[PDB]
Paper text:
To investigate how these SurA conformations are linked to conformational rearrangements of the BamA barrel, we prepared BAM and incubated it with a 1.5-fold molar excess of darobactin to force the complex into the outward-closed conformation. As expected, the BAM complex was in the outward-closed state. The outward-closed state was induced by incubation with darobactin. In the outward-closed conformation, we again observed a swing-in and a swing-out state of the BAM-SurA holo insertase complex. In the swing-in state, our refined map achieved a global resolution of 2.88 Å, allowing us to model BamA, BamB, BamD, and BamE, as well as the core domain of SurA. In the swing-out state density, with a global resolution of 3.62 Å, we were able to model the same components as for the swing-in state with the addition of the P1, while the P2 and BamC domains remain unresolved. The conformational space explored by SurA and the interaction interfaces are fully maintained in both BAM states. The coordinated movement of BamC and SurA could, thus, contribute to the productive substrate insertion into the BAM complex, where it can undergo the necessary folding steps to become a fully functional OMP. These rearrangements of BamA and of the folding substrate can readily occur in the swing-out state, as the conformations of the BamA barrel are fully independent of SurA motions.
After their arrival in the periplasmic space, the OMPs are taken up by periplasmic chaperones SurA and Skp (seventeen kilodalton protein) and subsequently transported across the periplasm to the OM. The insertase for folding and insertion of OMPs into the OM is the essential OMP β-barrel assembly machinery (BAM). BAM is a multicomponent complex consisting of five different subunits, the integral membrane protein BamA and the lipoproteins BamB, BamC, BamD, and BamE, which are anchored to the inner leaflet of the OM. SurA bound to BAM can undergo a large swinging motion between two states.
Author numbering:
A (entry chain E): 28 to 111
B (entry chain G): 1 to 7
C (entry chain D): 24 to 121, 132 to 242
D (entry chain B): 24 to 393
E (entry chain F): 21 to 282, 386 to 428
F (entry chain C): 30 to 87
G (entry chain A): 24 to 808
Amino acid sequence: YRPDINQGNYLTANDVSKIRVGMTQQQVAYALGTPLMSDPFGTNTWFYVFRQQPGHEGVTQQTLTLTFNSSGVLTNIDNKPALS
Amino acid sequence: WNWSKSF
Amino acid sequence: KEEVPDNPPNEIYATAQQKLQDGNWRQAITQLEALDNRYPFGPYSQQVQLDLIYAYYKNADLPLAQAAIDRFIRLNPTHPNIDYVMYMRGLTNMALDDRSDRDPQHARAAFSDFSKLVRGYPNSQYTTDATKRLVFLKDRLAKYEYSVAEYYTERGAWVAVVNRVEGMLRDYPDTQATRDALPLMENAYRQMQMNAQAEKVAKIIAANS
Amino acid sequence: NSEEDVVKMSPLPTVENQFTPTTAWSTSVGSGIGNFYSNLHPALADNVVYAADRAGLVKALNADDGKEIWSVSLAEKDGWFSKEPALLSGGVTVSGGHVYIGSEKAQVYALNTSDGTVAWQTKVAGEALSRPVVSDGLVLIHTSNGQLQALNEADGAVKWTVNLDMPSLSLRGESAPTTAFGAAVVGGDNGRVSAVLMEQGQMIWQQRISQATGSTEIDRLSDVDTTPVVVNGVVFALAYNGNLTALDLRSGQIMWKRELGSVNDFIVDGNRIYLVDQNDRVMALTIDGGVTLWTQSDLLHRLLTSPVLYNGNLVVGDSEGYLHWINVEDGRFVAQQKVDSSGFQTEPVAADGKLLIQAKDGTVYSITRW
Amino acid sequence: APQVVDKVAAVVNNGVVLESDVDGLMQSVKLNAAQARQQLPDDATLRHQIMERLIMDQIILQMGQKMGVKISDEQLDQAIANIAKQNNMTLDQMRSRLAYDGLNYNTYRNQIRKEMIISEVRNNEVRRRITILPQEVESLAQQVGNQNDASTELNLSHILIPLPENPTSDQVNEAESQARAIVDQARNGADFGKLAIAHSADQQALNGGQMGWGRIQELPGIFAQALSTAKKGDIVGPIRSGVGFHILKVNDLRGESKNISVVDKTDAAQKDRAYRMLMNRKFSEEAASWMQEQRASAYVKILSN
Amino acid sequence: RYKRQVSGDEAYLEAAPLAELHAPAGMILPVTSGDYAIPVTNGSGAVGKALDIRPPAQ
Amino acid sequence: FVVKDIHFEGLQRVAVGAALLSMPVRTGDTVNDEDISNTIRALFATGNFEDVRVLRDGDTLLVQVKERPTIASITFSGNKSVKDDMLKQNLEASGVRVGESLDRTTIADIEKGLEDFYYSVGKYSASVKAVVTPLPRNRVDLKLVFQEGVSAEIQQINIVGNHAFTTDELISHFQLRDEVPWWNVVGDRKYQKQKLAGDLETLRSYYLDRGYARFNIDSTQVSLTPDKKGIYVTVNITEGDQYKLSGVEVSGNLAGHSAEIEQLTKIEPGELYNGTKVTKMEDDIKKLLGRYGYAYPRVQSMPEINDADKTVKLRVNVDAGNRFYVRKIRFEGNDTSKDAVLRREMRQMEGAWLGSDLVDQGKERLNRLGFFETVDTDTQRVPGSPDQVDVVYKVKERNTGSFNFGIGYGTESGVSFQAGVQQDNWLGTGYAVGINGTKNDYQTYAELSVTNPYFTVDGVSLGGRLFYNDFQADDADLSDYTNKSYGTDVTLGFPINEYNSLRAGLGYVHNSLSNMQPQVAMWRYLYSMGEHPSTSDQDNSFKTDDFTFNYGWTYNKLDRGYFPTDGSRVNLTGKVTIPGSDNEYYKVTLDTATYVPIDDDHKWVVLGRTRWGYGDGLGGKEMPFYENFYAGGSSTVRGFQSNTIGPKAVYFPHQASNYDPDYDYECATQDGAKDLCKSDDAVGGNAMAVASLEFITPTPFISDKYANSVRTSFFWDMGTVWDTNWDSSQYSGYPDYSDPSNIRMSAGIALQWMSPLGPLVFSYAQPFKKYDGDKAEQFQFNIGK
């Protein structure tokens, strides 16, 4: 009934493998792209969300949260292939 | 015939 | 059709002033326009222009008011009574704005004009009203942003909602719109299973209200 | 809702007929050119009147009474139901037992006088509106596209072609080239007179005779030539909204000019040049220095037709169909007559003492005075 | 009371004419008239004519600026040799100009600049308008090569009655009637020079219409045929043309049999001279057409105060 | 037209005062950027039709 | 001359200091006529100077000047077809406007500019004259006189070189036109460069859609008549031989999507080249790439031509850009409509990967809404961002309220009047409120409608309706009875597939009946409801109130709303009464129309229509008679009088209300009536089945140039109506009206075209199978609204 709704960045499941630990902010932006979210509450964290929901066909969400350091250096990775 | 006059 | 007798400019201006005191602006506008056309270079051309701006503002001739204000600023950027014309610009932008969901471009223009006026001439009689109107305009803009955020929340987009309310926090950190919009961010983060941010939003809400 | 005209159509002048004109006979060809602008006009030869119409019908008429000798159509029919008009727009011309007619579909028909059978049919670059001039065993056609082509009389094959620049906007009509000393002088809507050798078409020289025309684009820049004429090594051309000029037959040097323009053909007699201005201003200019002898502006903006001299008297038709006889020596009117209500658009024909003219409806008329 | 120093005499499409320019040349022609034996009694009508010269000068000078035509200071020094007639009177210093302007160097030099700048552009514009046919060159060369005859030299005066390029019948008759009256007045006893001042539209109107010594073949055939039979002092005309009517008075006539020989080589010897002769008439015919074209097209509004 | 005939003449409205947002320990609120700032201006002018908007005689 | 003082006269707009800076000369210096001339020249070059005359006083250097007069006002005359305000806008754009000085040299310039504007808008003989009126204080007034003359019209549109298709057929699809029949609404006869370009593109597309790959337009010519009243347009083309599509090849940075793409490019080897098919393939590739995430998927196709075998080999180049994202979606100009109504029409959700197709679809939806006269799109770049952009929509609000009137005529409804006031945007909220009223020969209707198109952002629409209905049966050639009714309804709308639509709702209706002639069928229902009206008199009354649950389904797939050539339309409306209501019945209707073209150009189409209706009571009651289906007319079965098919009334012996001599009566007691009475008046039925098979062919005689505007159809219509509660055994003498075997058939020709006086439909039918009492009407037409 409703039209397709898209949200967040697009993850190809391949560029995610291209990012290692310690890569810089410029490097992650080049690999994936500028995120549509951040953690404004002090800590610098990049939230990549891949949410799509076609017409009456459920919802699929892939979450990729990147936690950097004070010098913009990647130090942690968390990937959620599907929501709980 | 059918007239319309936008107001 | 509102024929203007061609008496001396002093007489025409006196009649226009008297009619302005009466309150019927439709004749004052004609008198002032006739004076301007017949005497494009008069001893009190600046006063005539100011009176015409006032008449346009009070007669709902908003586009003519904007044109007159722009011309006056261009011709006399250093006139001693520049604060008055800036305040009139703010008021005419407000009147054009005239329902927070409508277009806020006029509100933004009025906010810019009032900010300029208050930052330039803070010792003029038209400053406290400028501050009050600026507060109202900020509240209106925040209300519009909250309205669009709520619409997107109902639609289902949980990214536009968080982005827009984050912008609301960034730009209007001290408005009831943001105070009432924080729960929208909390709900969006909870919907997307971002408990790490949902707890932060819950704390921010609790510590305030 | 009202309609107005910038220029008020001149009223019909009142004139006392010095000699009473008559109508020897008249025959209806067919539907006729209608409201369309075209050069389709009758032709006379060997006491035979050949005429056609826009539909595609061609008839041969007697030159003394108007009896029909033979007739034939050129609108191909795909059975009993479908029929496509031929859209003839080239003036009828006859030379050596042939009848050449232009068409709006880039087709030129060559019919036989005896029975009206199609001798041959050939395709050209584009619409053939110009009169099919004949000379040196060739048929010259000036198409709207600006391609001047020559066709073999016996066969009709294309011998050579010349390309003339065409402006974005022009007037509906092209110039009929005139031949002199094995060379054809032609004009184009661009506003230039061109002369090309008959044998191959090599460009001899080109001259521009348009006015300043520095005004707004495609407005006041319109300049068509409309069949220039040549006499005694002197080339005469007239350009619409331009200046009448006299050009050397060998190199194209401007001897003299005169600020005036028109699309109607002009006749050369003795040392006088009779021409009709674009505003329907009948005048006579001296052959040597273009000095006006007289003017007659009594038919201003009446849409006159190209004049033809008849018994020493100019003859012209208007959109209302009236025929106005005017003295050539003075320009004073001598006789006016009513012929048809359809209106006159094409030039008359004067030859062998017979005056012929075709109206919009296509009804041909023969004019005599008694 | 206040005294007027300068005013605007005419307004151009992209320029203006000042009333001070007419006064400067007004005195110059008046001074020249006394030395030239030709009396110059007219003041108001003569004042009218001089403004026309400035009007043509201003518009023509304006174009030279648009097209990018200038004058060199060194040229003025050379121009002093002939324009100021330094060769005739050996005084290149400004002291010679005792007449007026207080011996001001810049004013007269600028005055010299105007005279040549118009001539240079006028010569170029008319020259590029000329067209020459080999037929004409051969015809005239053979004509000049036919016994090398027609060496007659004429000093003649011309009076011009202007007409527009597109005149109406009433204007044609008015010009014709005026031209005939002048011709009748010329032969009845009226001085031809004064008639030139009053009515001549030619550039020589201030000079009495005198065209200077020349050869009969220079003028077109319309006047050559009349000049063949006319004797000294006769009045030729009136005759119409594109520019208007012309009235001619032959002041003097002379001729000689000084035939130039190489062989009367019409291909080389009499071709350049015939072509030069042909060019002379070509310049004059297209010089009168060009100037009138400039006048009609040029925007002008005479001013009065 | 009519909607604009009410705002222009005398309609004046007063909104709720601005309230500063508190920051709990352990986190910092987003930067403001000062794009829409209301600098404090001392002075008690005239408002709510107490202000004469007639142009001065100059 | 040494200068000790400087004075000026006439300086009005230029400041004395500015003028002093302008003149090179300065006080306390020697001055000569050359310096005076230089100063005058500088003053005139200033541009605000008209008459300059530097004057020396006894000691002072006085200056006098009139200056260029100021333009006080501008007046216009004769601009019949040109509006004064826009003409003034053009003038001020050119530069001349109020308050500025008037140059006394450019009068011809403004005249020629206005004449150029006239030429651009179409009029070529226009003449513009300016009149200048000097006024005191160096003021000037200018008046412009306009002689608009006449506007030239196209006299012909000729195409040369075409052999495969007739010129008339080629022009049939042209926006420009040369014939405008008074009986056809085809358009005007004006000339415009944009229209000419559109016609050229349409011709190129038409030729490319038939295998003429090498089609080329050599050039075009535009000519005018000497009177400058007629315009001729000529187009020269060179149509090459047809071509075949050998195969398709693709190459580019497909991003690992080659496998999926190949399926979209599959074709049948040995087909005709089709530019439309190529464009569809390109659009499909772009849509697939957009679905994958890319926002600007450039795609190009360059066919490779082999003239030896007349084959074409498509070469497809695919380029996928970078995945952009949308940060904000802003609307400007919606000073009245709120943000939500504009936003809900968007298809590119904010904060997601951008899509050009989605943005275009959103713009199209906004345009379809109709609240905006102009809609524009822009894609700005966020400062210092390589993949973030902002979408901004510029709209111009358009007035929504619209008074409406309408008049129509027809053999069924006779004279019809339509009048109502509609407001599509109530206070910029999307609510549609309007009042409409319909009047005809046999009914008067008036309703108040309020509906919210978006009750739920998904697309559900909530309605609402209050209606008053008056119905007179006698004027509708039925059994005499008057039904005055009024009620209110509310309904919902469920769009599920963009072609289907479910709608359900409740409704309350109160029906009042009076002045009814007794008859067996109607009295069946009346007795079923317990009433016992008298037979001798017709002054009977009956009132009822009913609550019904309304439901319906719709299906729309027609290619075009006017003169459809392919698709299908299915409608099913069903209503049933809920308990508590006096009436206990259920009504079901099913309308269907199918179009099936059997030609590539879709000129020949087979049309099939069907109509089914049924109903009956539930609690031992009977369906109300005033809800019976009616058959016959120009909508169900042509050739039959409107509402004439079906069971005929049976009249009881009764006394007329007011007997009149020599007056026709339905066998009243004053006419020797002593038993039941047969009649020939239709009463409708509770079951109806109408099927219409229609064959469409092009009009044979009308000119092919505009023949596409007239639809000619041969039809064979069959229908039938009967009553399922007719006790045949009880009334043996009269015909059995419960047998549906009495099928009625008819055939005839039908015409239909758009006319300046509204739609026109004509139909001549010759019913060949009819039963006793049926009233035939061969000629039927309807000038509808």
